[PDB]
């Protein structure tokens, strides 16, 4: 099969930054969205306005998205070990600040099966 591309998202309100990520991810293979739960999101930022099921109804309908799975924690390891993607895609915002430790763990965990992180310039102004 095609490679598996894992994309973590809160995705409270979809905007062109998200679309950019998904468009870049689709270049790498079939996208599985790791849709973060309330509890995951609450652990590092403000809770979203929309519920998990509401956010899922939107994101599952974005072009390029093959599957959507819950990501119950900010940390990606448990999901990465289950789905074993070839790629993870994220914006470069998480090189600094609250998600940096989670980013480092994505790189180290993916190395276990030779997966790669691909980072995209964050879309400014939105």
Instruction: Please report, as ranges, the residues that interact with a second copy according to CB under 8 A.
Output: 13-16, 19, 22-23, 50, 54, 57-58, 61-64, 126
The DSSP code for 74 is S
CA-to-CA distance for 39 and 61, rounded, in angstroms?
23
> Is residue 123 marked as binding?
yes
Which positions from 48 through 107 interact with ligand 7XL, judged by CB under 6 A? Answer: 90-91, 93, 99
Distance set, CA 83 to CA 12, 38, 65 (Å): 23, 21, 15
Which token pair is 60?
């599952």
Q: Which is nearer to a second copy, 20 or 102 (CB)?
A: 20
State the residues that interact with ligand 7XL by CB under 6 A.
8-11, 17-18, 20-21, 36, 90-91, 93, 99, 120, 122-123, 126
């Amino acid at each position: 099969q095609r490679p598996i591309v894992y994309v973590g998202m809160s995705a409270d309100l979809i905007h062109p930054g998200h679309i950019n990520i998904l468009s870049r991810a689709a270049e790498l293979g079939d996208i599985t969205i790791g849709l973060l739960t309330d509890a995951a999101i609450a652990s590092y930022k403000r809770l979203p306005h929309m519920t998990y099921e509401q956010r899922k109804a939107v994101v599952e309908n974005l072009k390029g998205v093959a599957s959507v799975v819950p990501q119950r924690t900010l940390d990606y390891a448990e999901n990465l070990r289950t789905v074993r993607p070839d790629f993870v895609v994220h914006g470069d915002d998480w090189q600094t600040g609250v998600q940096r430790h989670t980013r480092e763990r994505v790189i180290e965990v993916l190395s276990e099966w030779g997966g790669k992180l691909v980072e995209i310039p964050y879309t400014p102004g939105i």
